[PDB]
Amino acid sequence: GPAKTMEEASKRSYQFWDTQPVPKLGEVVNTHGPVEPDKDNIRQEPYTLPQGFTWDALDLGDRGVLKELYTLLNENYVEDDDNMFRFDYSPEFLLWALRPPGWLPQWHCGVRVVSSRKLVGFISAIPANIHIYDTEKKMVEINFLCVHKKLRSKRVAPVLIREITRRVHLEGIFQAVYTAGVVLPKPVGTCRYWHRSLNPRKLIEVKFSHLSRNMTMQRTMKLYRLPETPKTAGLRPMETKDIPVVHQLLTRYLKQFHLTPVMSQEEVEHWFYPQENIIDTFVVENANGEVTDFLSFYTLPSTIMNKSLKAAYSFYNVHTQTPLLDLMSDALVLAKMKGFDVFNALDLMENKTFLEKLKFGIGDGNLQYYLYNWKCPSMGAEKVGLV
Amino acid sequence: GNCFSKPR
Ligand SMILES: CCCCCCCCCCCCCC(=O)SCCNC(=O)CCNC(=O)[C@H](O)C(C)(C)COP(=O)(O)OP(=O)(O)OC[C@H]1O[C@@H](n2cnc3c(N)ncnc32)[C@H](O)[C@@H]1OP(=O)(O)O
């Protein structure tokens, strides 16, 4: 079964990952480069699925197929430690995460039951240029690995990982980045999720959170209380004319970390140009008409296995003139103004400078960052600049 | 792929 701590993991044997070009769990890494020479010929045939299951590439432009994808994900995707909450991926959100610039339909890899055509499996790859230490390499970001609950523990996830690798090798890419809540060989960096309450009562009824030892409900609300309006001057939603400068600010600010994306202006528009109930981005235009900072957070509500828990996830926040503490404080205010219930943020990047000061509490979940077929020293959360 | 964390 899954393992959530490395202590838990170092006892486990990895029947699949020991066969993969990833550093072993105990191995200390001080080299820089791939684990495997690029393959000159790639298997033309799809891998063999267990009897009664077939490959199918999902055309998310077909609204019916996209409906099949979110229904699969909304019923069988990531859950919390206690099986109380499950992500509620909207169709318009998945198009955002699954059709960025450069997407390929054969990278929307799904598994269907042969007889019924019922979608029972999925995995995805989107292209991304990744800066890791001192190498800028083109990789894919693997996301949305999902085997239906009725098919679990039958070694169908390894087949999905192999088949998506094959389809990415065919396009000439040989590295990949991905995250996870479980420990596998081998985390290049471990990031903790932190949680800032915005509506304490909602998260206490639903049992997302709990009242601290000697603290009433009344005090808890007066504690997380926030201003009605933000305080940074010139804060406003990002517009079309801000795509160049948001690219500029993000391109530069990101260079101080060791694992970061490398975005074209077309990609910066896609990932940051606001879409309601998907992505939000606010820029800080100063008294001279210049844009100096921006904050961003994306929307991902969670079904409650017992309405929905509206969560805001901190995305990329770039500061040059506004103090990051004030920037992130206004982010909390804007999230509250928009009806969110909680503001989730990792401890990666400079987030540790404000997580305690802005009343974040620590979460019971770590997000391990992995690289496929790339052997490099691991880093701390503050060096991981990839959300 | 994400993970669902929540306050310790
Ligand atoms: C060149 C480009 C290459 C691109 C490829 C890059 C690699 C991408 C790598 C994947 C990027 C994922 C990115 C995301 O989206 S991480 C999100 C993962 N999704 C979920 O947790 C959703 C809920 N769970 C499920 O859908 C299933 O339980 C999954 C699919 C997780 C496996 O449920 P099942 O019980 O049916 O599994 P199995 O018995 O068939 O097979 C188990 C084998 O697979 C190992 N396993 C278990 N969990 C994960 C995991 N979360 N990531 C990678 N491997 C995992 C497991 O330890 C064992 O290996 P080993 O222990 O024997 O070694």
Author numbering:
A (entry chain A): 104 to 409, 414 to 494
B (entry chain C): 2 to 9
Relevant lines from the article:
To challenge the primary importance of the water molecule channel in mediating Gly2 deprotonation, we created two truncated NMT1 variants in which the last 2 or 3 amino acids were removed. The crystal structure of the HsNMT1 deletion variant with truncation of the last two amino acids, HsNMT1ΔC2, shows the peptide substrate orientated towards Glu244, which becomes the new catalytic base, prior to nucleophilic attack at the carbonyl group of the MyrCoA (left). The 3D structure also reveals both an intermediate state in which the Gly2 is oriented towards the MyrCoA and a final state with the formed Myr-peptide (middle and right). Interestingly, the structure of the complex prior to nucleophilic attack shows that Gly2 interacts with the new catalytic base Glu244 via two water molecules of the water channel (left), confirming their importance for NMT catalysis. Accordingly, using an in vitro MYR assay, we established that the truncation does not alter the protein turnover rate (kcat) and observed a significant reduction in the enzyme’s relative affinity to the peptide. This suggests that the C-terminus of the enzyme is also directly involved in correct peptide adjustment into the catalytic centre. The water network shaping the water channel of the NMT:MyrCoA:X complex is unmodified in the various crystal structures described later. Such ordered water molecules ideally bridge the reactive amino terminus next to a catalytic base, usually the carboxy terminal but also alternative carboxylic side chains such as in HsNMT1ΔC2.
Glycylpeptide N-tetradecanoyltransferase 1, commonly known as N-myristoyltransferases (NMTs, EC 2.3.1.97), are universally conserved eukaryotic enzymes responsible for a major post-translational modification (PTM), myristoylation (MYR). NMTs are thought to transfer a C:14:0 acyl-CoA (MyrCoA) exclusively to the N-terminal glycine (Gly) of specific substrates. Here we report a series of high-resolution HsNMT1 structures co-crystallised with MyrCoA and reactive substrate peptides. These structures reveal snapshots across the entire catalytic mechanism including the reactive intermediate state, thereby providing the high-resolution map of MYR reaction chemistry.
